[PDB]
RNA sequence: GUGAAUUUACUUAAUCAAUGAAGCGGAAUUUCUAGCGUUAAAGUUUCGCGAACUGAUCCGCGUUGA
RNA sequence: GGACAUGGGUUAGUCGAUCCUAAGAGAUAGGGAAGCUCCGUAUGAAAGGCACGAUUUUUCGUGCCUAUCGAAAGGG
């Protein structure tokens, strides 16, 4: 309680002491690429998005997402190192002259690749389809919900391309497909089919025929709200 | 058959002589302090701007955000003296030299260096002895009707700012020059626009009015607005002509 | 494959989907430079049928001409 | 002296032993001192008047 | 944790700038010193004015390289004749060749040094 | 281009004005004088110019204005 | 003989150039143009710095703010 300390308060009114260092993040002259990112996000919100594009705005729920990804991590495809090891082991088996065709078992893994998955859906071999929500050229997946609906294939739009990529040991995966599983996972798969179809395919539909976008803001909707209430 | 003097005035030797200019006379950039309150500055010096009939005023303000002094170049109004305090903002008083929004000043206020639009730092009533009159306000549309020195009526946003008072240096045109030499010196600091040869004193290759055995035009000197650049000579798009 | 769907969808460029994509893409291409490197083809099957392979040594540039 | 020629003088030859010595004249400094003190007195009085 | 911006400007961040680590040297062999003392000193001058400077001013006059400067001439003279100069003056002759006046110290005799060179 | 009942409105496309793209939209709730104003500090909570939290509200975030 | 021939002759820390900027030239960012090239000079650019720390999850944190050329009479 030394009396030498004293307060010396600063007043930051207009014409008073210099303004303190404030957060100016909403006034920064951002680089051109950052402005491109944010105004593209704003543009997609403002504009009237067609139903075939806005249907990708309705994605899978979190609880359904974690369980389907839990199923997928059991059927990740073999890595390059595992493939080399298996080929080396079977090559030694051939050198020892044993049954190379029966020493190995049929692989059980998720299917990936846009052309491969699309062909599987057309061939009715796909049991579950998971579509990345943000495929940058949207034409690559825009037809997939309609294709899966015609062919009676259960399909979901899951969050983010990278999660599907990490399942298949890639940076990116536009779409993943489950075509065969093991008997212990038949029940878990069927539950995921039921949840996905009920919430996402049997539901919406009327939503995938409706128009997205058109959201004004952030202060113009406050302007209209003030005008309407006045 | 030759490019005429009017056409050649697109630059080069017809540029403005800008060595001795003392800065561009502008209001403060419209900031938060001047939008919501007032900021006080000190008149440091009243200076002569070469080529300008009115004096300039160097006014030092404080940067509201940094420890530095911002010096602004104003068009001096009559009665401005060195050491005077000038207040700019919405809550500024109605005193000569203060910069206020036109919407905050009563009808009939004499103002100068008025802004055409909010934030362009001064467009109207800038020459010596000239001023703008606040005819009235329209609060619903947020506009202000003002009388310009040409007598025209103009609408400006109520947030546009204007300096209270008349631009200093009035009566500068009353004195006859008496001299080509004094007209030479006046225009020597402005541009190459003097002396002026008449078109009728030229040759046909040089001007529409040139040629002929007697110095005459031969056609009407009132010309349309759609005419070509080489044709826009004399009285362009004159509604009335002659001395009343 | 999906390239067949991409081709027949690109034929329909007066559809609502293509009109919306044309609006947003034209806006963002104007915001970039006149000549700017494209990270990937915006029409992968159009590039594919014209000779583009997706391996090192192949490059895509976007350019707007008045 | 010329500007570069000032660098060869010692500090006392380029300054006056007073506040702002070598920057302001004696009368200018005195006006600074009186004006500072008087306006500080004014704002103290105005603070007393407006605090109540 | 949102980063606070107090400048209203975005200034390009500083990134690591690795130094060059070439897989090969672009030149296999480094060039020899292009200007050594045998190229710096071309010839002495034995004209009558050159002799006069030798016998009175204790100064040696040399035809030197164009690229030679005062420092290189002093080092060349010191290394070629074991005498240290105290002063060097240079001029480009109207024929395009450089000529250096080399004032030796009182420790050295310009007459003697001229004799060892052989042009005296 | 998007709406609301030729009639009104909106802004994201484009146009214009300003700047160092500082205080925009919501909610919570400095004028007797040619002076100086920076390099926080008191308050609170941990542990000396070491910290933290406020001093200096929150939220949205579309740099503002036409 | 300013001609012809033969030689010789111009020595700088202090005198200038070099340095600075002037009017003005002129890259860069960008935008035009079939192009040669044009416009543009802090502009619609991510246009660079400086300081503190027992060493910080031995994978860096916390703060603070414009080329060049162009004067042997200009400046120095």
From Swiss-Prot, chain A:
This protein's GO CC annotations: cytosolic large ribosomal subunit; preribosome
Chief location category: cytoplasm
A GO molecular-function annotation: structural constituent of ribosome
Subcellular location: Cytoplasm
Residues with Phosphoserine modification: 11
GO biological process per UniProt: cytoplasmic translation; maturation of LSU-rRNA
Pfam families recorded: Ribosomal_L7Ae
Range of residues in the leader sequence: none
Keyword vocabulary terms for this entry: Cytoplasm, Phosphoprotein, Ribonucleoprotein, Ribosomal protein
InterPro entries, per database record: eL8/uL1-like, Ribosomal_eL30-like_sf, Ribosomal_eL8-like_CS, Ribosomal_eL8/eL30/eS12/Gad45, Ribosomal_eL8/Nhp2, Ribosomal_eL8_euk
Functional note: Component of the ribosome, a large ribonucleoprotein complex responsible for the synthesis of proteins in the cell. The small ribosomal subunit (SSU) binds messenger RNAs (mRNAs) and translates the encoded message by selecting cognate aminoacyl-transfer RNA (tRNA) molecules. The large subunit (LSU) contains the ribosomal catalytic site termed the peptidyl transferase center (PTC), which catalyzes the formation of peptide bonds, thereby polymerizing the amino acids delivered by tRNAs into a polypeptide chain.
Family stated for the protein in its record: Belongs to the eukaryotic ribosomal protein eL8 family.
PANTHER family, per the entry: RIBOSOMAL PROTEIN L7AE FAMILY MEMBER
Protein name: Large ribosomal subunit protein eL8
Organism: Schizosaccharomyces pombe (strain 972 / ATCC 24843)
Gene transcribed to yield this protein: rpl8
UniProtKB/Swiss-Prot annotation, chain B:
Domain of life: Eukaryota
Pfam families reported for this sequence: Ribosomal_L2, Ribosomal_L2_C
UniProt-listed GO biological process terms: cytoplasmic translation
Keyword Acetylation: no
Keywords, ordered alphabetically: Cytoplasm, Ribonucleoprotein, Ribosomal protein, RNA-binding, rRNA-binding
Molecular functions per Gene Ontology: RNA binding; rRNA binding; structural constituent of ribosome
Coiled-coil positions: none
Subcellular location: Cytoplasm
GO cellular component: cytosol; cytosolic large ribosomal subunit
Keyword check for Signal: no
Role played: Component of the ribosome, a large ribonucleoprotein complex responsible for the synthesis of proteins in the cell. The small ribosomal subunit (SSU) binds messenger RNAs (mRNAs) and translates the encoded message by selecting cognate aminoacyl-transfer RNA (tRNA) molecules. The large subunit (LSU) contains the ribosomal catalytic site termed the peptidyl transferase center (PTC), which catalyzes the formation of peptide bonds, thereby polymerizing the amino acids delivered by tRNAs into a polypeptide chain.
Subunit field text: Component of the large ribosomal subunit (LSU). Mature yeast ribosomes consist of a small (40S) and a large (60S) subunit. The 40S small subunit contains 1 molecule of ribosomal RNA (18S rRNA) and at least 33 different proteins. The large 60S subunit contains 3 rRNA molecules (25S, 5.8S and 5S rRNA) and at least 46 different proteins.
Homology family: Belongs to the universal ribosomal protein uL2 family.
Additional observations: There are 3 genes for uL2 in S.pombe.
Protein known as: Large ribosomal subunit protein uL2A
Curated annotation (Swiss-Prot), chain D:
Keyword flag Cell inner membrane: no
Span within the parent record: 57 to 108 of 112
Keywords (A to Z) from UniProt: Cytoplasm, Ribonucleoprotein, Ribosomal protein
GO biological process terms held by the UniProt record: cytoplasmic translation; ribosome biogenesis
Subcellular location: Cytoplasm
Name under which the protein is recorded: Large ribosomal subunit protein eL34A
GO CC annotation, single: cytosolic large ribosomal subunit
Metal-binding as UniProt keyword: no
From Swiss-Prot, chain E:
Gene3D superfamilies: 3.30.70.330
Post-translational modification Phosphoserine, affected residues: 47, 49
Protein name, entry field: Large ribosomal subunit protein uL23A
GO CC field: cytosol; cytosolic large ribosomal subunit; preribosome
UniProt xrefs under InterPro entries: Nucleotide-bd_a/b_plait_sf (IPR012677), Ribosomal_uL23-like (IPR013025), Ribosomal_uL23/eL15/eS24_sf (IPR012678), Ribosomal_uL23_CS (IPR001014), Ribosomal_uL23_N (IPR005633)
Superkingdom classification of source: Eukaryota
Keyword Secreted tagged: no
Alphabetical GO biological process terms: cytoplasmic translation; cytosolic large ribosomal subunit assembly
């Amino acid at each position: 309680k030394n009396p030498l300390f004293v307060s010396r308060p600063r007043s930051f009114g207009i014409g008073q002491d210099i303004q303190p260092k404030r957060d100016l993040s909403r006034f920064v002259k951002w680089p051109e690429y950052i402005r491109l990112q944010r105004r593209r996000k704003i543009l997609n919100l403002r504009l009237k998005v067609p139903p075939a594009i806005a249907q990708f705005q309705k994605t899978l729920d979190k609880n359904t997402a974690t369980q389907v990804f839990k199923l997928l991590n059991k059927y990740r495809p073999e890595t390059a190192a595992e493939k080399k090891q298996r080929l080396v082991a079977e090559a030694e088996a051939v050198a020892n002259g044993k049954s190379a065709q029966d020493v190995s078992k049929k692989p059980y893994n998720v299917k990936y690749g846009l052309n491969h998955v699309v062909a599987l859906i057309e061939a009715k071999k796909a049991k579950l389809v998971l579509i990345a929500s943000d495929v940058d050229p949207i034409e690559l997946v825009v037809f997939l919900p309609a294709l899966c609906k015609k062919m009676g294939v259960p399909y979901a739009i899951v969050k983010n391309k990278a999660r599907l990529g990490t399942v298949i040991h890639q940076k990116t995966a536009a779409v993943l497909a489950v075509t065969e599983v093991r008997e212990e996972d038949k029940n878990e798969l069927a539950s995921i089919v039921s949840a996905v179809d009920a919430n996402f395919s049997a539901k919406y539909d009327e939503s995938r025929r409706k128009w997205g976008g058109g959201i004004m803001g952030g202060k113009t909707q406050a302007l209209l709200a003030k005008r309407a209430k006045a | 058959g030759r490019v005429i003097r009017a056409q050649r005035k697109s630059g080069g030797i017809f540029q403005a002589h800008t060595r001795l200019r003392k800065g561009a006379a502008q209001l403060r950039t419209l900031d938060f302090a001047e939008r919501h309150g007032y900021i006080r500055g000190v008149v440091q010096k009243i200076i002569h701007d070469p080529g300008r009939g009115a004096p300039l005023a160097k006014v030092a303000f404080r940067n509201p955000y940094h420890y530095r002094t911002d010096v602004e170049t104003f068009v001096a109004t009559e009665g401005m003296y060195t050491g005077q305090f000038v207040y700019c903002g919405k809550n500024a008083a109605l005193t000569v030299g203060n910069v206020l929004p036109v919407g905050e000043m009563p009808e009939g206020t004499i103002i100068s260096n008025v802004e055409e639009k909010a934030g362009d730092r001064g467009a109207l009533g800038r020459s010596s002895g000239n001023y703008v009159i606040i005819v009235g306000h329209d609060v619903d549309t947020g506009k202000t009707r003002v009388k310009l020195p040409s007598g025209a009526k103009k609408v400006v946003p109520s947030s546009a700012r204007g300096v209270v008072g008349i631009v200093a240096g009035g009566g500068r045109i009353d004195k006859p020059l008496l001299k080509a030499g004094r007209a030479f010196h006046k225009y020597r600091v402005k541009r190459n626009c003097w002396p002026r040869t008449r078109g009728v004193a030229m040759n046909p290759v040089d001007h529409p009015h040139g040629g002929g055995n007697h110095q005459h035009v031969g056609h009407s000197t009132t010309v349309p607005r759609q005419s070509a650049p080489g044709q826009k000579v004399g009285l362009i798009a004159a509604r009335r002509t002659g001395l009343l | 494959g999906a390239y067949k769907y991409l081709e027949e969808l690109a034929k329909k460029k007066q559809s609502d989907v293509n009109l919306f994509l044309s609006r947003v893409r034209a806006w963002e291409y104007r915001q970039m430079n006149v000549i700017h490197r494209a990270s990937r083809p915006s029409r992968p099957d159009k590039a594919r049928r014209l000779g583009y392979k997706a391996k090192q040594g192949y490059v895509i540039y976007r350019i707007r001409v008045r | 002296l010329r500007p570069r020629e000032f660098a060869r003088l010692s500090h006392n030859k380029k300054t006056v032993q007073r506040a702002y010595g070598g920057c302001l004249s004696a009368n200018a400094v005195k006006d600074r001192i009186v004006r500072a003190f008087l306006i500080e007195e004014q704002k103290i009085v105005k603070q007393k008047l407006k605090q109540l | 944790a949102k980063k606070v911006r107090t400048s209203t400007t975005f200034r390009r961040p500083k990134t690591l700038q690795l130094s060059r680590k070439p897989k090969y040297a672009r030149k296999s062999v480094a060039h020899a010193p292009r200007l050594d003392e045998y190229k710096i000193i071309v010839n002495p001058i034995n004209s009558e004015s050159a002799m006069k400077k030798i016998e009175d001013d204790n100064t040696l006059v040399f035809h030197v390289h164009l690229k030679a400067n005062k420092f290189t001439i002093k080092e060349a003279v010191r290394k070629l004749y074991s005498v240290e100069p105290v002063k060097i003056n240079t001029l480009i002759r109207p024929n395009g060749t450089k000529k250096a006046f080399v004032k030796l110290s009182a420790d050295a005799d310009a007459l003697d040094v001229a004799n060892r060179i052989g042009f005296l």
